[PDB]
Design a protein around this ligand. Structure first.
Ligand code: CLA
Ligand code: CLA
Ligand code: CLA
Ligand code: CLA
Ligand code: CLA
Ligand code: CLA
Ligand code: CLA
Ligand code: CLA
Ligand code: CLA
Ligand SMILES: CC1=C(/C=C/C(C)=C/C=C\C(C)=C\C=C\C=C(C)\C=C\C=C(C)\C=C\C2=C(C)CCCC2(C)C)C(C)(C)CCC1
Ligand code: SF4
Ligand code: FES
Lengths: 81, 88, 743, 97, 73, 80, 42, 157
């Protein structure tokens, strides 16, 4: 399976969503988006170790989102061309 | 504060919300015509008795002299009649 | 802030002492009886939890364990159904030849000649033909032997005992506290993603491994005993790959994302299976997969314990505009402190859902061999319509209870509720008007039609032959639904249902499963009658809810309660001002509306849908197709529907359908018996009881618990209860006798 | 059984003995310490009073708030003195509020 | 009850079919089917999609009476 | 206006005056009972006729009685 | 256990038992002497 | 900002203000209609009334009555609309007769929307109501006549 097929697409998709979630630019466990414009700060109480306040809950969430978005566009592109 | 013993109608709300009080927009040649010709029908007892008896007149008239194309009740039967379960 | 389990140990102790003291829950009943009225109150207030006490924690504990009791009861009823299918049924023979054996899972003992009720249902068996449609479910499940039915009966009995024990446990040993109940975000996350998501995922799993292969074998013609057992399909997989090659790659696609390679058994066909007259199973499995995905994702919306999610309070507070002031601010505080508000919303939605289920299950039949079983289809549609109507009426009851006992602008203020309260007069005015106008323009057309048909003027009627009223939008929409597959739905082959059209007709065993349903002037008239009845019911219930607290007539109505007889004969007379009386009146109108709905469906299906088809292909409908021309007058409903179809039930004496003939008459009797309670009042009855009591006193045989006449409210309630029972049972006997007799 | 009763009163505080199967009012009627009543049927607030100690059987009491029996007030004419009680008299209006 | 009794007895006597009453009168399904339902056909066919005859005025009145009655409820 | 009458069996419990929703009734001094109190009905032109007072009277038979009589605007409870 | 003996004598349970026993008795009588219109003994 | 306000700031009158009852377009329109032209002769307003309503009541009696297809009698069904005009003007007359007396002022409000005095609308008289009755009736019958006069083919006769 690994080579240059679905692998490339899904890996770059989940990777960019993780890169977003870790930094700002995306709602997260320590970031509460107001109305899709900007983000506030919040200490969820769940302790992490990453210097940017990247929780395991955050990682799981953005990983699921990367997989959903990658599955979507993969099926689209392979159904139209 | 909307309570004023002096003016009661403003406290109980006796306004005209859509009245105008503007001058007439029907210039007098048109008004002239109407209030000249449309006067004799402006007395209560006169109008009522006239309307009743004239409507009755037209109804008795058009009822006594209506033609067959109008009312099947007038054209009568056009067939021989059946006999009842025994009688007829 | 965070979410956790919170429970108390041993709140109440298991004892019998409170069984021997009737009415322990209420201080007034506990004191004991002086008059017979006591015995009635004891039952009327038995489940009025929030009136026995003031503490919200206690009410919620009681509600939780009462729910466990209800679930235990339901499991016991399921256990009975499966045991009767296993032990006193002809299910195996019906499995052998479904279009000749009529299903039966109840036999009677030969005691007083009643064994005549054990009729010839085919297959070497004599009993009562059932109409719940359980054989169709068991066939769609893959069940092929009575041992599986026994096994499920035993499992259900076990589960019922488990539910009962949990009901005892959560009330007497480990009772959760208020903060546990009041966590709605975690609750919604679990019910969306855990109960509905995992449920339909697991069920899609069972259909992919059991129902699909066993039904493939059954439709291939194989003897129901020579089909492999389901677990074989799981142990040996070449069995599966013979019927569906895609099961050879076996989850490699689902990961390689080439879901195309599953098109074997996950399809998007649309339409019916022309062998069994039901939906393709390969469509239902794919449907359940999709629904499970959707729910599992939707159960991750609300924030519980990790920041991510949505706060319900935030969503509600964000919504407001220049017409509604501050609206939705203050509904989270209300919807978390009153059980009655929750119950009203939930009842409204569940009733509407049941009605939608009725429509969708007639129009796109889910089970195999259900569409040609006419009695089961009629029974299911009618049953579910009645349930939906009742639940919708209860919704109004509990909205009124919330308005009388719980609404409080001093400590929980919401803007939208306040504004609706501040223009209720205009609201009720406009609804009143539209119901009058709708009643003139639908029933009035029928009266015009009857009078023109009796006056020898049929060219002046409202009908397809004289003055047409074609529902252009309905015809336009079903034409769009006909052209949909291929144009606006390129992935579909046939359209969703056969009622839309396209000239496709499905037959089974020489019977008609489905074909395009024609819309005409009569359909237009009937639908406007339906709009009229629903609008009237709404007027009554909403008037009851909006004026539950005060009126221009009685300005402190909330102080008299939710259920009171009147406020005396003054002010002109104020009988039936309470909201309970509005619910009481709305029950009659719901009965009216649902009755007309089921009459319209029953006559229309026989007239233009059901029937028999010939090898040459000429369809003969049960009734001759007389709905288009006889439904437009009232005389046609009295003559061609009631008088002509009551023949089956008034001729069942001496046959196996004679129980329906007995119930017809019994139901007429109970209906007429209620009018005595509805038309009279309790003063007359108490004064008659006076003289009867004298006669008993004359012989030292008079009772110490002094007999009273019933309450005013109890009189009304007994009246409506017997009225509904009589009417619905009459229609029940009529329908079942008629549909079972012809076919 | 016949526990001793204590009634504060503008006349003073006096005791009388009287069995538990009785209503307080007829028992203050026995020895002769006058108390205010109107109804003798538990349907008004003239015989109202509150308690200093113990508590009194209010099973056959009616026309009372779903609280008047949980924060002190009692009607003397429909009340059974389960214990050696100490009660108040002439207590209608601070009950009437 | 009185007039139902009189009319059923007499209508079966006028038809030379007295045994019909003598057999069907002893149970209430007999009254419902053999008297009420059986004797209603012509009245309710007074007018129908295929025309009207002189029973029309009764077929109409029959329904009037059913309407007024129900409004009384 | 309806009629309201008070009879000398009254024990002066005041329960009827507390119940009236239109303030028809009143207590006045007396000498025929332990309460030295008796009900009176000075304002019967405002009585809506609800008999809320009769449900409250404890004597057997009643000591307050309401006889419905000629109807007016106030008696019918009309806000228009 | 005494409380159970009391509870079993409350009105609905007592009547339920009384009538179930009566029903069994009449049912068995009619199963033994079916279709009786008269007293055929003496 | 909010759109609904109590009627003229008084929150204890039984009504409200909306874009439906107090809006500039609606206010100006409803003001320029005959019934709301307070300072105009009752008979002129009644004339407008009767004209418009006879003309309107032509159509339905023609296109729906019993002789709609018989056209040796289809068009002349304006007789019916004339009769309806006669009947509801008899009703107007008895209403005015019972509701008023000449020796009494006209019950209309004397205040306006801002708190100035007006001369009470005379349509609410006995005299002026009989005048308005005559106007409406004259207009109604001659409007029936007018819309019967236009029997020339247009789009749907
Ligand atoms: C009890 C007496 C009675 C009589 C004699 C009539 C007679 C008539 N009705 Mg009628 N009807 C009655 C009771 C009666 N109705 C009741 C109680 C109802 C309520 C259910 C109805 C409801 C009803 C409807 C819905 C309709 C009729 C119609 C008709 C007309 C049908 C025949 C036709 O086409 O004429 C010839 C056609 C004409 C247009 C003749 C018009 C009559 C003259 C020209 C009107 C002049 C009026 C006059 C100025 C004053 C009015 C009355 C005055 C004497 C006080 C006919 C003249 C139909 C009709 O034609 O509508 C008008 C019709 O639509 N009726
Ligand atoms: C899968 C989600 C995830 C998880 C569970 C962690 C977990 C952790 N990270 Mg990491 N991190 C993540 C994502 C994640 N990170 C991402 C997406 C980036 C950007 C590429 C980083 C960049 C990052 C850096 C630069 C460092 C960590 C460090 C750490 C560790 C700090 C705790 C410790 O060792 O001493 C308590 C810890 C185990 C720190 C570490 O390793 O400790 C010295 C540290 O140096 N993280
Ligand atoms: C950016 C690349 C890309 C491309 C080229 C496509 C292309 C396509 N997608 Mg896709 N999709 C993508 C990204 C992409 N998608 C991503 C990132 C996601 C995840 C968010 C999805 C999620 C997705 C779903 C869930 C579906 C598609 C579907 C489709 C196909 C048909 C949809 C259509 O046009 O009909 C028009 C569709 C409509 C008019 C919808 C109307 C029906 C609604 C529900 C009724 C309105 C009621 C409403 C609830 C109120 C199409 C070939 C559909 C498919 O599976 O094809 C077979 C499908 O259902 N996509
Ligand atoms: C995945 C988790 C989950 C699941 C599956 C359920 C399922 C259910 N809940 Mg529940 N709930 C949950 C989490 C869950 N809940 C959480 C987290 C909370 C708040 C903390 C609540 C609070 C709650 C309340 C207040 C109520 C429910 C109720 C119900 C029942 C609804 C009626 C119904 O549809 O019956 C469908 C019937 C079946 C599906 C038959 C199978 C029954 C299975 C065995 C249920 C087992 C699930 C349960 C969570 C097991 C935990 C017990 C374990 C410790 C031994 C249903 C069985 C109602 C109820 O309790 O009725 C008694 C109700 O009143 N729930
Ligand atoms: C929660 C539902 C559910 C459950 C419990 C199972 C369980 C199982 N599936 Mg499965 N499956 C499901 C849903 C489910 N399936 C759905 C919805 C699909 C459609 C995508 C599939 C399609 C599928 C395939 C293609 C295969 C299985 C197979 C299997 C079995 C392999 C054993 C294993 O490794 O685990 C197993 C018993 C394998 C099998 O058949 O083993 C016999 C197999 O190859 N399933
Ligand atoms: C989830 C469903 C649900 C739930 C949990 C409740 C719960 C409650 N309801 Mg409610 N209600 C519902 C649905 C529901 N209702 C529906 C669908 C309706 C519309 C009919 C109503 C209408 C309603 C009213 C009008 C009232 C309530 C009231 C109440 C409260 C007290 C009920 C009680 O104990 O009375 C006791 C229960 C009985 C006495 C049993 C009655 C037996 C019926 C009449 C016989 C039915 C015949 C049977 C089906 C078949 C015949 C068998 C026979 C031949 C042997 C309680 C909190 C009462 C209240 O005051 O709220 C505070 C109140 O008066 N409900
Ligand atoms: C407005 C009416 C309407 C409706 C109700 C539908 C409904 C549907 N269309 Mg469709 N479509 C329409 C108009 C409509 N379409 C029009 C005018 C065109 C252009 C001719 C298309 C072109 C089109 C294509 C090419 C496809 C569909 C498909 C579908 C089906 C899948 C829906 C979906 O993709 O989920 C929704 C997808 C989402 C991303 C959610 C978006 C929410 C919506 C857009 C709001 C669905 C039943 C797909 C199909 O064939 O299914 C098998 C598909 O292939 N449609
Ligand atoms: C067959 C009996 C019957 C009839 C005809 C009605 C009729 C009506 N009910 Mg009622 N109802 C009934 C039984 C009946 N009900 C029973 C048994 C109960 C007890 C549960 C109720 C309880 C009830 C309630 C609680 C309410 C109603 C309401 C209404 C009115 C609804 C508005 C409407 O549709 O206007 C249209 C009128 C009709 C459809 C009647 C027929 C119209 C005829 C055919 C027109 C003929 C006109 C004729 C030419 C007159 C001229 C004749 C001339 C000689 C004078 C309506 C008048 C509701 C209401 O008032 O709505 C505002 C209301 O809330 N009903
Ligand atoms: C007032 C009404 C009434 C009366 C007088 C009768 C009378 C009778 N019924 Mg009947 N029945 C009735 C109502 C009535 N029924 C109703 C309303 C129903 C519908 C539920 C039925 C349904 C019914 C059935 C199905 C049957 C009867 C039968 C009988 C006969 C039974 C004789 C018998 O039991 O043997 C003798 C019984 C005894 C001697 C008991 C006394 C012994 C005691 C217990 C011992 C005391 C010793 C000292 C009997 C003549 C049976 C029959 O045979 O019909 C011909 C039978 O099959 N009934
Ligand atoms: C710490 C660390 C780091 C970092 C790392 C990372 C970055 C990680 C990550 C990550 C990951 C590794 C992730 C993953 C993910 C994924 C997920 C989380 C998923 C999922 C899934 C799901 C759940 C799905 C489902 C579905 C849907 C939804 C639809 C369709 C169907 C399906 C089934 C597909 C560094 C090197 C710096 C340093 C050292 C260590
Ligand atoms: S007692 Fe009965 S009749 Fe009298 S007002 Fe009350 S509800 Fe009406
Ligand atoms: S006298 Fe009023 S309570 Fe005893």
């Amino acid at each position: 399976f690994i080579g240059s097929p679905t692998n490339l697409i899904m890996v770059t998709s989940t990777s960019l969503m993780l890169f977003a979630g870790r930094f700002g630019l995306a709602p997260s466990a320590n970031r509460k988006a107001t109305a899709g414009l900007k983000l506030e700060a919040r200490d969820s109480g769940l302790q992490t170790g990453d210097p940017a306040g990247f929780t395991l809950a955050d990682t799981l969430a953005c990983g699921v989102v990367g997989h959903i978005i990658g599955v979507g566009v993969v099926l689209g592109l392979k159904n139209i061309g | 504060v909307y309570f004023d013993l002096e003016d009661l109608g403003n406290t109980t709300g006796q306004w005209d919300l859509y009245g105008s009080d503007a001058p007439s927009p029907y210039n007098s040649l048109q008004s002239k015509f109407f209030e000249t010709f449309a006067a004799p029908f402006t007395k209560r007892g006169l109008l009522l008795k006239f309307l009743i008896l004239g409507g009755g007149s037209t109804l008795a008239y058009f009822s006594a002299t209506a033609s067959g194309d109008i009312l099947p009740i007038k054209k009568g039967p056009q067939l021989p009649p059946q006999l009842g379960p025994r009688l007829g | 802030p965070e979410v956790k389990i919170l429970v108390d140990r041993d709140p109440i102790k298991t004892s019998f002492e409170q069984w021997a003291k009737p009415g322990h829950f209420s201080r007034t009943i506990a004191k004991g009886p002086d008059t017979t009225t006591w015995i009635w109150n004891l039952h009327a207030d038995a489940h009025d939890f929030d009136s026995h006490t003031s503490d919200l924690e206690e009410i919620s504990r009681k509600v939780f364990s009462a729910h466990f009791g209800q679930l235990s009861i339901i499991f016991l009823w399921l256990s009975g159904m499966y045991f009767h299918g296993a032990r006193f049924s002809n299910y195996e023979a019906w499995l052998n030849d479904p279009t000749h054996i009529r299903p039966s899972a109840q036999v009677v003992w030969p005691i007083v000649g009643q064994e005549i009720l054990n009729g010839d249902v085919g297959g070497g068996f004599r009993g009562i033909q059932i109409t719940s449609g359980f054989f169709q479910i068991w066939r769609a499940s893959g069940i092929t032997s009575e041992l599986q039915l026994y096994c499920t009966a035993i499992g259900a009995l076990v589960f019922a005992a488990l539910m009962l024990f949990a009901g005892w446990f959560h009330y007497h040993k480990a009772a959760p506290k208020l903060v546990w109940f009041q966590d709605v975000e975690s609750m919604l996350n679990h019910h969306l993603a855990g109960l509905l998501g995992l449920g339909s995922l697991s069920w899609a799993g069972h259909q992919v491994h059991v129902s699909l292969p066993i039904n493939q074998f059954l439709n291939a013609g194989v003897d129901p005993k020579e089909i492999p057992l389901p677990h074989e399909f799981i142990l040996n997989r070449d069995l599966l790959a013979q019927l569906y090659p895609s099961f050879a790659e076996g989850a490699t696609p689902f990961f390689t994302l080439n879901w195309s390679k599953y098109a074997d058994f996950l399809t998007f066909r649309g339409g019916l299976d022309p062998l069994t007259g039901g939906l393709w199973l390969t469509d239902i499995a794919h449907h359940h997969l999709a629904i499970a995905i959707l729910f599992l994702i939707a159960g991750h919306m609300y924030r519980t314990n990790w920041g991510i999610g949505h706060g319900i309070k935030d969503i509600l507070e964000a919504h407001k505009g220049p017409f509604t002031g501050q609206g939705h601010k203050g509904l989270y505080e209300i919807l978390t402190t009153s059980w009655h508000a929750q119950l009203s919303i939930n009842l409204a939605m569940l009733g509407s859902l049941t009605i939608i289920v009725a429509h969708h299950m007639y129009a796109m039949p889910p089970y195999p061999y259900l569409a040609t079983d006419y009695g089961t289809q009629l029974s299911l549609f009618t049953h579910h319509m009645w349930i939906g109507g009742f639940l919708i009426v209860g919704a109004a009851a509990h909205a009124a209870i919330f308005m009388v006992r719980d609404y409080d602008p001093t400590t929980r203020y919401n803007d939208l509720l306040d504004r609706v309260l501040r223009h209720r007069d205009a609201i009720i005015s406009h609804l009143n008007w539209v119901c009058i106008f709708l009643g003139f323009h639908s029933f009035g057309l029928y009266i015009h039609n009857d009078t023109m048909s009796a006056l020898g003027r049929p060219q002046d009627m409202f009908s397809d032959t004289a003055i047409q009223l074609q529902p252009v939008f309905a015809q336009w929409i079903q034409n769009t639904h006909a052209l949909a597959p291929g144009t606006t739905a390129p992935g579909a082959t046939t359209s969703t249902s056969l009622t839309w059209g396209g000239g496709d007709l499905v037959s089974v065993g020489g019977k008609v499963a489905l074909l395009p349903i024609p819309l005409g002037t009569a359909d237009f008239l009937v639908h406007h009658i339906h709009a009229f009845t629903i609008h009237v019911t709404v007027l009554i219930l909403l008037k009851g809810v909006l004026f539950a607290r005060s009126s221009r007539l009685i300005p402190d109505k909330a102080n008299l309660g939710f259920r009171f007889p009147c406020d005396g004969p003054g002010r002109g007379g104020t009988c039936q001002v309470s909201a309970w009386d509005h619910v009481f009146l709305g029950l009659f109108w719901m009965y009216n509306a649902i009755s007309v709905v089921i009459f319209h469906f029953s006559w229309k299906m026989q007239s233009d849908v059901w029937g028999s088809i010939n090898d040459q292909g000429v369809v003969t409908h049960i009734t001759g197709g007389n709905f288009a021309q006889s439904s437009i007058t009232i005389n046609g409903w009295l003559r061609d529907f009631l008088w002509a179809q009551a023949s089956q039930v008034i001729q069942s004496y001496g046959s196996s359908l004679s129980a329906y003939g007995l119930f017809f008459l019994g139901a007429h009797f109970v209906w007429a018996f209620s009018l005595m309670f509805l038309f009279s009042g309790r003063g007359y009855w108490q004064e008659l009881i006076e003289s009867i009591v004298w006669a008993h006193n004359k012989l030292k045989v008079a009772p110490a618990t002094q007999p009273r006449a019933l309450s005013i409210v109890q009189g009304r309630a007994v009246g409506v209860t017997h009225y509904l029972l009589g009417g619905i049972a009459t229609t029940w006997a009529f329908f079942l006798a008629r549909i079972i007799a012809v076919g | 059984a016949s526990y001793k009763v204590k009634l504060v009163t503008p006349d003073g505080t006096q005791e009388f003995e009287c069995p538990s199967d009785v209503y307080i009012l007829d028992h203050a009627e026995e020895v002769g310490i006058d108390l205010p009543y109107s109804c003798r049927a538990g349907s008004c607030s003239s015989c109202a009073g509150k308690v200093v100690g113990g508590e009194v059987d209010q099973s056959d009491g009616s026309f009372l708030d779903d609280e008047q029996i949980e924060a002190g007030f009692v009607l003397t004419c429909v009340a059974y003195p389960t214990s050696d009680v100490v009660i108040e008299t002439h207590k209608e209006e601070d009950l009437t509020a | 009850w009185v007039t139902f009794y009189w009319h059923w007895k007499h209508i079966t006597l006028w038809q030379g079919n007295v045994s019909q009453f003598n057999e069907s009168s002893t149970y209430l399904m007999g009254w419902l089917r053999d008297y009420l339902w059986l004797n209603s056909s012509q009245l309710i066919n007074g007018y129908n999609p295929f025309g009207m005859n002189s029973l029309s005025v009764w077929a109409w009145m029959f329904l009037f009476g059913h309407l007024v009655w129900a409004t009384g409820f | 206006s309806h009629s309201v009458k008070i009879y000398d069996t009254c024990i002066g419990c005041t329960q009827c005056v507390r119940a009236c929703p239109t303030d028809v009734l009143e207590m006045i001094p007396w000498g025929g009972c332990k309460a030295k109190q008796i009900a009176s009905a000075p304002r019967t032109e405002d009585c809506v006729g609800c008999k809320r007072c009769e449900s409250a009277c404890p004597t057997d038979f009643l000591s307050v009685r309401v006889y419905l009589w000629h109807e007016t605007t106030r008696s019918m409870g009309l806000a228009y | 256990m005494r409380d159970l003996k009391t509870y079993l004598s409350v009105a609905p349970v007592a009547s339920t038992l009384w009538f179930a026993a009566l029903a069994g008795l009449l049912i068995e009588i009619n199963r033994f002497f079916p279709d009786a219109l008269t007293f055929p003994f003496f | 900002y909010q759109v609904v306000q109590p009627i003229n700031g008084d929150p204890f009158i039984g009504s409200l203000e909306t874009p439906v009852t107090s809006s500039p377009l609606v206010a100006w329109y409803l003001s320029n209609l005959p019934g709301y032209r307070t300072a105009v002769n009752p008979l002129l307003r009644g004339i407008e009334v009767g004209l418009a309503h006879g003309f309107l009541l032509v159509g339905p009696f023609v296109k729906a009555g019993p002789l709609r297809n018989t056209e040796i009698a289809g068009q002349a069904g304006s007789l019916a609309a004339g009769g309806l005009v006669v009947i509801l003007s008899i009703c107007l007359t008895i209403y005015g007769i019972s509701s008023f007396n000449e020796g009494d002022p006209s019950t209309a409000p004397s205040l306006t929307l801002t708190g100035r005095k007006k001369q009470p609308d005379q349509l609410q008289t006995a005299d002026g109501w009989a005048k308005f009755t005559g106007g409406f009736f004259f207009g109604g019958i001659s409007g029936v006549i007018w819309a019967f006069f236009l029997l020339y083919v247009l789009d749907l006769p």
